[PDB]
Amino acid sequence: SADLRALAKHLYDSYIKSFPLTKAKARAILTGKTTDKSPFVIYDMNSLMMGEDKEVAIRIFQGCQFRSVEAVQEITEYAKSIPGFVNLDLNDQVTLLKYGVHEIIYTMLASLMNKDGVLISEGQGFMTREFLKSLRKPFGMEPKFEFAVKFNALELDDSDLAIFIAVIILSGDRPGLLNVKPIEDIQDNLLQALELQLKLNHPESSQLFAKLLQKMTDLRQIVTEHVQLLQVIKKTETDLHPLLQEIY
Numbered sequence: 001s002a003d004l005r006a007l008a009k010h011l012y013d014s015y016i017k018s019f020p021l022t023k024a025k026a027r028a029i030l031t032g033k034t035t036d037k038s039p040f041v042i043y044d045m046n047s048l049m050m051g052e053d054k055e056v057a058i059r060i061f062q063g064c065q066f067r068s069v070e071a072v073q074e075i076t077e078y079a080k081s082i083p084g085f086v087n088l089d090l091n092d093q094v095t096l097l098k099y100g101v102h103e104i105i106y107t108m109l110a111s112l113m114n115k116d117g118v119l120i121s122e123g124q125g126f127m128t129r130e131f132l133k134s135l136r137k138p139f140g141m142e143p144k145f146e147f148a149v150k151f152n153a154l155e156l157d158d159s160d161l162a163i164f165i166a167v168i169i170l171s172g173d174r175p176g177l178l179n180v181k182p183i184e185d186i187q188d189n190l191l192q193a194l195e196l197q198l199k200l201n202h203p204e205s206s207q208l209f210a211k212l213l214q215k216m217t218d219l220r221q222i223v224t225e226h227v228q229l230l231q232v233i234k235k236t237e238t239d240l241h242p243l244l245q246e247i248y
């Protein structure tokens with residue numbers, strides 16, 4: 001039990017060290033807290049180009065593409081610090097990440113979100129949900145917002161997210177994995193540690209562990225729909241990053 005707690009601290013340390021915008025910073029920026037600075041708000045085309053100070057719809061997709069890329073670099077950096085990940089068969093490390101990064105992006109994306117919009121550029125900016133929903137065509141972050149709303153109601157902090165994200169990466173159901181068993185061995189560990197952490201950090205909360213695993217369903221749905229859209233865009237525009245091209 002003391003070992004699981006120690007494993008939780010490790011993941012947390014590494015999470016802090018791998019992701020410069022945490023959920024705690026992001027919430028401070030959103031709630032006008034004096035620990036951090038207020039963002040500029042992008043709510044329309046006028047304030048959009050007013051906010052680039054700092055086609056529009058194409059410019060914002062490419063922007064999301066560039067931010068996704070950095071996300072992958074940071075998530076990759078984080079995976080290397082999960083005990084046993086770097087000991088795994090190389091082809092599988094690549095496999096696990098290739099299929100997990102999207103799921104993690106949306107998880108941490110919820111960290112940047114409220115029912116009214118999302119933080120961007122390390123909290124410097126705040127693009128509104130309506131402005132995005134009105135962006136066209138095609139430009140329709142709306143399901144990401146609905147998951148965010150549901151997701152953020154669990155009220156997990158960064159030390160929760162750190163373990164949960166580790167679990168996601170270590171998914172032995174990932175397609176085309178050579179050796180499944182060691183990955184599962186690691187995930188079982190992460191899982192058991194997530195169980196204890198949620199039981200210690202949210203004691204009044206019931207079945208939060210179960211509730212937190214169920215959300216992995218929602219994540220699959222989101223990512224499938226995302227990939228479909230991106231494939232349609234790829235055939236309606238002739239002219240992705242070498243990392244972006246790799247995952248897709």
Ligand SMILES: O=C(O)Cc1ccccc1Nc1c(Cl)cccc1Cl
Pocket residue numbers: 019064065067068069070071074104105106108109110112119120121122123
């Ligand atoms: O612009 C932002 O920072 C939000 C954003 C949009 C698209 C893709 C990624 C990100 N941010 C982001 C980053 Cl930079 C790292 C880890 C997880 C997330 Cl959600």
